[PDB]
Design a protein around this ligand. Structure first.
Ligand SMILES: C=C(C)[C@H]1CN[C@H](C(=O)O)[C@H]1CC(=O)O
Ligand SMILES: C=C(C)[C@H]1CN[C@H](C(=O)O)[C@H]1CC(=O)O
Ligand SMILES: [Cl-]
Ligand SMILES: [Cl-]
Ligand SMILES: [Cl-]
Ligand SMILES: [Cl-]
Ligand SMILES: [N+]
Ligand SMILES: [N+]
Lengths: 254, 254
């Protein structure tokens, strides 16, 4: 039987394909994660239906501690796999079973080119430049939970004024960096994609932490360890590197 | 419960402590992996007994498909955990379980500063500068199995002439780089440790691949998932970063 795969639109992982006619089914989509799912299905021999997560969220807890997003789909057995840039975090790994990482990344800073700002510390010790993150994503959660001095300071700033420095999604954050005096705390793999495409933006500093994206499965899933092995195969054969180059390469920026 | 932990001496992961008198039991050792044990044991509650792997190997297969080293200890249920720089690989994942990674690295090149060599391709396209890897380690296995043309070329060279370009262990490789015209293919975290301590040596190029070290367990072990959760906790709190900095930082280079 066919596996149900929950996912979410996010460039260049999952995108609607361009066509002159309405699209249906898996043919609606392309991107890094679709290529990954193709290669996993060729190794393991499953068929799959891709289904966008109905609430359009990744996965976080409400005040009752109930989950939402892709994470909740897995928990409730409404999906067999989640294939998306879903960050492997302590809070999520308690409730679902992630494969080992297919991509390795960290939080970093997206900002304008040409400025004296060089680090998170540089941001934290001032108030003129605004800075934030996507609300309720793993980056925000990192700042909220940190007991490291600099990151707390930054959290105090981000959460101030009813979280006015936060944004609902990455595209809103990018447009805010492009238009106003604002820096976005963003996952490094997304910064790499953005800066290959808008030449006035750059990454500031290095990575603030280290983590991965993994395929999500419900706790107890027999597919988890099989997908880990298939990922390690694809990594060792250079295929994951090829897939990243295909989807990230931009040809217009210095 | 007291867990039995298999490990191997490897700087700065597991080292004999310095003392005026003979040392006994866990008190014989210090290093990044001993610190990681103390943190995992604090989180999860277990006691532990560290025992060096009797054959002094990590774990590779022979012709008959038989395993040795720490991997074979876990397969045979002679240890509960392997805590070491044990690379998470496709072949080992088929026979043991691993936690998610506590460190993320890739193969790169250790060579002398101030030469024209800038990449693996530079090494592959010539025969004058010798290059190789630790025999039967995961780096050697990477080259042996690769179908990427550059890496196939490299493997043909390393394996030529009775594997004269390979070395038995990392310290042998580092002495050969320091004395002769030789480059060592080495995991990037060990290169960082070496270059902090040998100011004439450097990493050449970037990482050739991406992989992690994980705690090994027998297949089916209930500790594997508990240790993963504990590692994610330590990562997000910045403790793994602090541990790396403690063991890696050297006295400075001119
Ligand atoms: C695109 C966003 C909302 C996702 C992607 N990975 C993170 C997650 O899985 O929580 C979120 C990004 C962030 O928090 O910077
Ligand atoms: C120190 C050595 C022999 C180990 C460490 N990790 C690799 C392993 O787990 O196979 C080996 C290194 C390498 O192959 O470059
Ligand atoms: Cl078409
Ligand atoms: Cl859908
Ligand atoms: Cl895992
Ligand atoms: Cl021992
Ligand atoms: N899990
Ligand atoms: N496994």
């Amino acid at each position: 039987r066919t596996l149900i795969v929950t996912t979410i639109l996010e460039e260049p992982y999952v995108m609607y394909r361009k066509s002159d006619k309405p699209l249906y089914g898996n043919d609606r989509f392309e991107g890094y994660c679709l290529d990954l799912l193709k290669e996993l299905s060729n190794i393991l021999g499953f068929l799959y239906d891709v289904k966008l997560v109905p609430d359009g969220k990744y996965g976080a807890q409400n005040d009752k501690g109930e989950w939402n997003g892709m994470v909740k789909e897995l928990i409730d057995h409404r999906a067999d796999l989640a294939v998306a840039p879903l960050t492997i975090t302590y809070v999520r790994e308690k409730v679902i079973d992630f494969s080992k990482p297919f991509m390795t990344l960290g939080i970093s800073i997206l900002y304008r080119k040409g400025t004296p700002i060089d680090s998170a510390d540089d941001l934290a010790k001032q108030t003129k430049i605004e800075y934030g993150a996507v609300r309720d994503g793993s980056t925000m959660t990192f700042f909220k939970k940190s007991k490291i001095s600099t990151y707390e300071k930054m959290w105090a700033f981000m959460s101030s004024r009813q979280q006015s420095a936060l944004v609902k999604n990455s595209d809103e954050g990018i447009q805010r960096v492009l238009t106003t005096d604002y820096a976005l705390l963003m996952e490094s793999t997304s910064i790499e994609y953005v800066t290959q495409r808008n030449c006035n933006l750059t990454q500031i500093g290095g990575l603030i932490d280290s983590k991965g994206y993994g395929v999500g499965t419900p706790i107890g899933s027999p597919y988890r360890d099989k997908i880990t092995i298939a990922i390690l195969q694809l990594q060792e054969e250079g295929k994951l590197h090829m897939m990243k180059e295909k989807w990230w390469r931009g040809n217009g920026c210095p």
